[PDB]
Amino acid sequence: RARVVCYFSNWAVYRPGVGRYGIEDIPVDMCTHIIYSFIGVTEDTQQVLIIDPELDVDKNGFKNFTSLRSKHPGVKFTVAVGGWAEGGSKYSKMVAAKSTRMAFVRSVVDFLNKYNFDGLDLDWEYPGAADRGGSFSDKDKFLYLVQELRRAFIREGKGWELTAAVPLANFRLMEGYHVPELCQELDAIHVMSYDLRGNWAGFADVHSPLYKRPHDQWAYEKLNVNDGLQLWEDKGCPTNKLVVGIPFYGRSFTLSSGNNNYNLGTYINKEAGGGDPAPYTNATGFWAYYEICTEVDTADSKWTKKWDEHGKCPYAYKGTQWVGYEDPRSVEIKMNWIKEKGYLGAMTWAIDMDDFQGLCGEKNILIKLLHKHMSAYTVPPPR
Ligand SMILES: N[C@@H]1[C@@H](O)[C@H](O[C@@H]2O[C@H](CO)[C@@H](O[C@@H]3O[C@H](CO)[C@@H](O[C@@H]4O[C@H](CO)[C@@H](O[C@@H]5O[C@H](CO)[C@@H](O)[C@H](O)[C@H]5N)[C@H](O)[C@H]4N)[C@H](O)[C@H]3N)[C@H](O)[C@H]2N)[C@@H](CO)O[C@H]1O
Ligand SMILES: *[C@@H]1O[C@H](CO)[C@@H](O)[C@H](O)[C@H]1NC(C)=O
Ligand SMILES: *[C@@H]1O[C@H](CO)[C@@H](O)[C@H](O)[C@H]1NC(C)=O
């Protein structure tokens, strides 16, 4: 009764060579809930924005995805609205008034019917965030949107789910999330327990540490998966609504010139923007799990791999390049910890970055760990 929630990226199909990952590559039976990412919202009319219509509509991407339910009827196929690239200002604007929320709600309902989705995942990043076009009143108005969506979904009578992807930093919670009320209205809270460290922070570190490290201070002190999930609990979310995100990717850095200290917390060349882009994701500071294992785990690798003994994550470096990520050891630690805490399950950003080709070993190695642990686990009553 645990969830394995798999975000699926519609842009992964454009990655070259063995990076290409399409609907047909999703290992459906390893997931309980699969979320097509992303649709957005229009700036002017508060309607659903289809972001890649040639793929999503003309080549039937949405429908190919939802019709996977024919062969896998026990799995739920939903769509996520928002995402980082969408920005937050259009969402803050959409929720500002009852009339614009109801326009979006009607548009969402038509869209879910049209493409036979099982519901919607809200991924506005983030209500209340001044750095993302948000403002103080988003906290109330995001909750109104959620309540209004739930009521529309009820009226539609198809039992659609409504979930949200959420951050775990206290200040973000305070600025954007009425926790008890959101947790009551939503079927699952997909906690983004990753991107907790990265080039933006000005030092090298793993991005999904499970527990506090000695160098963690001030805003970073509780910015780890264990304390962040504990914060959601403390703020009133039941244990059996919280799903813990696991990144199938690393945050990388270019170290500062002449820097021979590779320890956690070491200074970086921040203007580099992150580690050099890898060949398939081609994004500074960001490497898919399969881009990491093909470099770090080969027999003749010149990478040095280390282990964060407190955060329970691997990191690896070579020359000026340094990357923190998740590997089978760290993911297994997190699966055991999820079961120890009694949370609703595990989530991944994103299924298209697992080693789905078996370039390094067994295919789909990371999602198989989520599936192995969660499928044998019974979620206990709320704590
Ligand atoms: N919820 C949080 C997530 O949002 C977050 O992960 C991020 O999500 C965002 C979306 O919100 C991702 O943004 C997408 O990034 C894509 C890849 O960079 C962009 O697509 C590409 O854009 C390129 C420019 O046009 C194109 O590059 C070309 O490639 C060609 C192949 O045809 C090549 O021939 C050519 O020479 C190139 N021009 C490419 O075609 C195209 N697909 C997309 O626009 C963009 N919006 C972001 O990547 C992702 N990291 C997550 C992690 O932070 O946390 C989440 O949970
Ligand atoms: C949808 O499936 C059809 C039939 O296999 C295929 O031709 C098309 O490429 C698929 N579209 C996408 C976006 O995966
Ligand atoms: C990789 O992204 C870089 C930097 O954005 C861009 O200049 C280039 O066109 C991309 N290369 C490929 C192969 O997509």
Between helix 328-341 and helix 365-375 the angle, nearest 10°, is 20
Which residue from 218, 162, 163, 214 is spatially nearest to 191, judged by alpha carbons?
163
Burial class (CB in 10 A: 0-12, 13-18, 19+), 338: buried
Which residue from 230, 232, 215 is spatially nearest to 311, judged by alpha carbons?
215
Q: How far is residue 36's CA from residue 190's CA, in Å, rounded to a whole number?
A: 14
Burial class (CB in 10 A: 0-12, 13-18, 19+), 124: buried
Buried b (16+ CB within 10 A) or exposed e, 250-265: bbbbbbeeeeeeeebe
- State the DSSP H helix or E strand holding residue 16, giving kind and residue range, or none if neither: none
Ligand 1 atom closest to the Cα of residue 349 is 56
Q: Using an 8 Å Cβ cutoff, are 34 and 8 in contact?
A: yes
258 conformational bin, left if phi > 0, alpha if psi -120 to 50, beta if neither: left
Going by C-beta distance under 8 Å and a sequence separation of 6 or more, which residues neighbour residue 267?
A: 202, 203, 204, 255, 256, 259
Burial class (CB in 10 A: 0-12, 13-18, 19+), 87: middle
Which residue from 269, 270, 287 is spatially nearest to 278, judged by alpha carbons?
287
Q: How far is residue 90's CA from residue 44's CA, in Å, rounded to a whole number?
A: 9
Going by C-beta distance under 8 Å and a sequence separation of 6 or more, which residues neighbour residue 349?
A: 7, 192, 194, 245, 246, 247, 248, 249
5 conformational bin, left if phi > 0, alpha if psi -120 to 50, beta if neither: beta
Q: Using an 8 Å Cβ cutoff, are 6 and 121 in contact?
A: no
Experiment type: X-ray
Pair of tokens at residue 107: 């548009």
Buried b (16+ CB within 10 A) or exposed e, 352-364: bbbbbbeebeeeb
Q: Which residues pair with 40 in a beta bridge?
A: 49
Pair of tokens at residue 303: 């990478």
Q: Using an 8 Å Cβ cutoff, are 313 and 330 in contact?
A: yes
Ligand 1 neighbours (beta carbon < 6 A): 11, 14, 38, 83-86, 123, 165, 192, 195, 283, 286, 349
CA distances from 244 to 189, 221, 376 (A): 8, 19, 17
Which residue from 201, 206, 304, 282 is spatially nearest to 246, judged by alpha carbons?
206
Nearest CA to ligand 1 atom 46: 85
Q: How far is residue 321's CA from residue 276's CA, in Å, rounded to a whole number?
A: 8
Q: Is 26 in the pocket of ligand 2 (CB under 6 A)?
A: no
Please give the CATH topology (third level) of the domain spanning 1-247+326-383.
TIM Barrel (3.20.20)
Asked whether the CA dihedral 191, 194, 198, 204 is positive or negative, the reply is positive
Pair of tokens at residue 39: 């649709």
Q: Is 23 in the pocket of ligand 2 (CB under 6 A)?
A: yes
The ligand that comes nearest to the alpha carbon of residue 61 is 2
Strands of 304-308's sheet, edge to edge? 286-288, 249-254, 321-324, 313-318, 304-308
Determine whether 125 is an active site residue.
Answer: yes
β-pairing verdict for 188-191 and 119-123: unpaired
User: Where do the H-state alpha helices sit in the chain?
Assistant: 53, 61-66, 89-94, 98-115, 138-156, 170-176, 179-185, 225-234, 289-296, 328-341, 365-375
Burial class (CB in 10 A: 0-12, 13-18, 19+), 119: buried
Q: Where are the domains of the chain?
A: 1-247+326-383, 248-325
- Give strand ranges (E) for the chain: 3-9, 33-41, 48-49, 76-82, 119-123, 161-166, 188-191, 242-247, 249-254, 286-288, 304-308, 313-318, 321-324, 345-349
Which residue from 114, 296, 324, 107 is spatially nearest to 201, judged by alpha carbons?
324
Pair of tokens at residue 2: 């645990």
Nearest CA to ligand 1 atom 13: 85
Residue that the structure tokens 């309607």 belong to? 47
| CATH classification for the domain delimited by 248-325, as one of 3.40.50.2000, 3.40.640.10, 3.10.50.10, 3.30.910.20 | 3.10.50.10
Burial class (CB in 10 A: 0-12, 13-18, 19+), 123: buried
Q: How far is residue 193's CA from residue 210's CA, in Å, rounded to a whole number?
A: 9
The ligand that comes nearest to the alpha carbon of residue 84 is 1
Q: Is 20 in the pocket of ligand 2 (CB under 6 A)?
A: no
Q: How far is residue 124's CA from residue 184's CA, in Å, rounded to a whole number?
A: 18
Q: How far is residue 215's CA from residue 229's CA, in Å, rounded to a whole number?
A: 20
| Resolution, Å (one decimal) | 2.0
Burial class (CB in 10 A: 0-12, 13-18, 19+), 47: middle
Which residue from 349, 348, 248 is spatially nearest to 289, judged by alpha carbons?
248
